[PDB]
């Protein structure tokens, strides 16, 4: 059950696949991060969600990625996953759902770019 008077926040998290198969040559990583990561910065500010691009190719740098994978450091474990966008929100339920709805809708625009 959700309890609207609880002192815990809700967390919502989603990992949305970047559709590399549907759009094999589209540079989603470049488009989502934007120059110096300003697009994703703005995306987070406008939606109030934490949003990261994770998985292989998320760093646009085959060689850097390979080197951070091979170090074995668990913070880079995500570099073996499928490329995806990771959205995380927290709050009381009404706010969490609303933030996730907003984030999910904005992210969907980037991931279905010919819509």
DSSP 21: T
DSSP 92: S
Looking at the Cβ atoms of 15 and 69, the one nearer to a copy of itself is: 15
| Single residue of 8, 11, 15, 88 touching a copy of itself by CB under 8 A | 15
Angle at 21 between CA 78 and CA 16, to 5 degrees: 45
> 110, 27 in Cβ contact below 8 A?
no
CA distance 88 to 103: 9
Which range in 10-18, 27-35, 64-72, 107-115 contacts Li ion by CB under 5 A?
A: 107-115
- Give the one entry of a copy of itself, Li ion, none that residue 5 binds, where binding means its C-beta sits below a cut-off of 5 to 8 angstroms depending on kind: a copy of itself
- The residue ranges that bind a copy of itself (CB under 8 A) are 1-5, 14-17, 19, 22, 82, 84, 93-94, 97-98, 100-101, 104-105, 108, 111-112
């Amino acid at each position: 059950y959700l309890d609207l008077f609880s002192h815990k926040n809700m967390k919502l998290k989603e990992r949305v696949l970047i559709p590399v198969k549907q759009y094999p040559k589209f540079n989603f990583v470049g488009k989502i991060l934007g120059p110096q990561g300003n697009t994703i910065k703005r995306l987070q500010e406008e939606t109030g969600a934490k949003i990261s691009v994770l998985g292989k190719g998320s760093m646009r740098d085959k060689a850097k990625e390979e080197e951070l994978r091979k170090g074995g450091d668990p913070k880079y474990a995500h570099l073996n996953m499928d490329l995806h966008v990771f959205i995380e929100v927290f709050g009381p339920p009404c706010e969490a759902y609303a933030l996730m709805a907003h984030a999910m809708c904005e992210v969907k625009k980037f991931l279905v770019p010919d819509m």
